[PDB]
Structure 1
Amino acid sequence: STGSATTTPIDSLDDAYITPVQIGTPAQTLNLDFDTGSSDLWVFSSETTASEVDGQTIYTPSKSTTAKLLSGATWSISYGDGSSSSGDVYTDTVSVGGLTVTGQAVESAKKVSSSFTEDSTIDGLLGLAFSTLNTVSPTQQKTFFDNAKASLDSPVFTADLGYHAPGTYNFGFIDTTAYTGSITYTAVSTKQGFWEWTSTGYAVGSGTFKSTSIDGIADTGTTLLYLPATVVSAYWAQVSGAKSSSSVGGYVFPCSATLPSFTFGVGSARIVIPGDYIDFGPISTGSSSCFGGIQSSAGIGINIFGDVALKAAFVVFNGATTPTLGFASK
């Protein structure tokens, strides 16, 4: 089997991407944030504290003939950006782009943090990291991909995120028309539960490539590119007037600037992030100070190849017995 679904930016900045997901019988379609940095499929629901629902589409298990309460099971998650959610668990039928899993753990939110309430476009998350990170207790649950894996033509999914435009998540096959050149594959560590890999270095604009190992995670659920302070400093030094602002919470730059590209290494290959991808607009409406799309990972504890990086590539998440990651230009 295979599946193919379109993923759409939630706003003009590509702050996140939503992908339609069918849950239950008859289908209830919710727009979920596919997140290769977490491993819970959770949704706004009929059980969510009413004051914490503001415009989202909810999953109502009682209207699904295939929903079954997973007795005793609860979940609770906190994300790298400080947001959180928790609740109980149903199993139900879940389909993505024509690919169907029966008995998928659907985690029903009773509580969500303000960040989620305030974002009316995201109805929940669909985790695509490794199932070892799943928060369901006392019985840990498998991700959608894990459940689908054996049925897929090939045990892979691919992320093809658009810049200011829709893209595609595919399951079970590699669309050879979706990228240019070759796909370069690189080793993955699953020891922390993430799609963790090591980039071979970077360049700033037309600058010379610096060979250096950068350990990081491929995370579709994170907006920006978070790298070591040395790297980030070298990038923003090439932008006149750019500075790190503690009050704003990272590097800002004059909105009148032309940003240089940023290249990262995948083995011997190179992925180029155009400068425009690194512009996240005025820090506040009407401001001439713009927020940078490359930020320091210092104090996160891990480097994160977020959407800024991933949307510049066609990315293969290979879930073979020994997982790997592939990157191609497009």
Structure 2
Amino acid sequence: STGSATTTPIDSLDDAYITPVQIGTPAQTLNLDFDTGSSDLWVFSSETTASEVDGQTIYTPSKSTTAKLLSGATWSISYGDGSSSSGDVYTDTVSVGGLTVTGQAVESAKKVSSSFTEDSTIDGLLGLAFSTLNTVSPTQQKTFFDNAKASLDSPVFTADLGYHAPGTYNFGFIDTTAYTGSITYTAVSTKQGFWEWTSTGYAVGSGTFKSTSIDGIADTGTTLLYLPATVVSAYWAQVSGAKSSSSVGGYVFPCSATLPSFTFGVGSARIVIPGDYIDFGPISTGSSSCFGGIQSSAGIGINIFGDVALKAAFVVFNGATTPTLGFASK
């Protein structure tokens, strides 16, 4: 089987992308943030504290004839950005882009942190990291991809995120018309539960490529590109007036500046992030200080190839017995 769904930016900055997901019978369609950095499929629901719901579409298990409470199971998750959610668990039928999984664990939120409440466009998350990170207790649950992968024509999914435009998540096939050139595959470590890989280096603008190993994770649920402070400093040094601001929480630059591109290595191949993808706009409405899309990872513990990086590529998440990642230009 295969599936194919369009993913749409939630705002003019590409701060996140939402993909419609059909849950239950009759279908309830919720717009979920596909997140290759986590492993829980959780949703706003009829069980979420009413004061913590503000415009989201909710899943109501009682209205689904295929929903079944997963007796005793609870979940609680805290994300790298300090947000969190928790609740109980149903199994139900879940379909993405025509691909259907029966018995999928659908984590119903009873509580969500403020950042989720305040974002009316995201109705939950669909984790696509490895199932070892799933938070359901006492019986850990499988991700949608893990449940689907036996049925898929090929055990893969692809992320083709758009720059200021919709893109595509495909399951079970590689759309050879969606990219240019060839796909370069690179090794993945699953030891932390992430799509963790090692970039071969970087270049800033038209500068020379620096060969150096940069271990990091491919994370569709992170907006920005977080890299070691040495790399980030080398990038912003090429932007006149750019500076790291403790008050704002990272590198800012004059909105009048033209940003250089940033290149990252995938084996012997190179992915070029155009400079315009690194512009996240004014730090506050009307300000002439703009927020940079490449930031330091020093205070994270891990480098993160977020959407700024991934949207410059056609990315293959190969879930074969020995997983790999593939990157092509597009």
TM-score, scaled to structure 2: 1.00
**Displacement after TM superposition at 1:86 (Å):** 0.1
Q: What secondary structure, in the 3-state scheme, does the structure 1 residue paired with 2:232 have?
A: helix
- Residue by residue over 1:107-132, the C-alpha shift from the partner in whole angstroms, topping out at 9 and shown as x without a partner, is 00000000000000000000000000
**Displacement after TM superposition at 1:249 (Å):** 0.1
Q: What secondary structure, in the 3-state scheme, does the structure 1 residue paired with 2:150 have?
A: helix
CA distance in 1, matches of 2:39, 2:104: 12
Structure 1 unaligned regions, length at least 5: none
CA distance in 1, matches of 2:207, 2:324: 29
**Displacement after TM superposition at 1:80 (Å):** 0.3
Match of 2:49 in 1: 49
Match of 1:282 in 2: 282
How do residues 147-296 of structure 1 correspond to structure 2 at under 5 angstroms? 147-296=147-296
- Residue by residue over 1:137-188, the C-alpha shift from the partner in whole angstroms, topping out at 9 and shown as x without a partner, is 0000000000000000000000000000000000000000000000000000
Find runs of 4+ consecutive structure 1 residues off by over 6 angstroms.
Answer: none
CA distance in 2, matches of 1:80, 1:236: 24
- Residue by residue over 1:295-329, the C-alpha shift from the partner in whole angstroms, topping out at 9 and shown as x without a partner, is 00001000000000000000000000000000000
Q: What secondary structure, in the 3-state scheme, does the structure 2 residue paired with 1:62 have?
A: helix
- Residue by residue over 1:253-302, the C-alpha shift from the partner in whole angstroms, topping out at 9 and shown as x without a partner, is 00000000000000000000000000000000000000000000001000
CA distance in 2, matches of 1:175, 1:78: 34
Q: What secondary structure, in the 3-state scheme, does the structure 2 residue paired with 1:277 have?
A: helix
- Residue by residue over 1:223-262, the C-alpha shift from the partner in whole angstroms, topping out at 9 and shown as x without a partner, is 0000000000000000000000000000000000000000
Cα root mean square deviation, aligned: 0.1
CA distance in 2, matches of 1:122, 1:81: 16
TM-score, scaled to structure 1: 1.00
State the percentage of identical aligned residues. Answer: 100
- Residue by residue over 1:197-230, the C-alpha shift from the partner in whole angstroms, topping out at 9 and shown as x without a partner, is 0000000000000000000000000000000000
Match of 1:125 in 2: 125
CA distance in 1, matches of 2:163, 2:54: 27
- Residue by residue over 1:41-95, the C-alpha shift from the partner in whole angstroms, topping out at 9 and shown as x without a partner, is 0000000000000000000000000000000000000000000000000000000
Structure 2 unaligned regions, length at least 5: none
CA distance in 2, matches of 1:158, 1:119: 26
- Number of residue-to-residue matches in the alignment: 330
**Displacement after TM superposition at 1:102 (Å):** 0.0
Q: What secondary structure, in the 3-state scheme, does the structure 1 residue paired with 2:85 have?
A: strand
Match of 2:20 in 1: 20
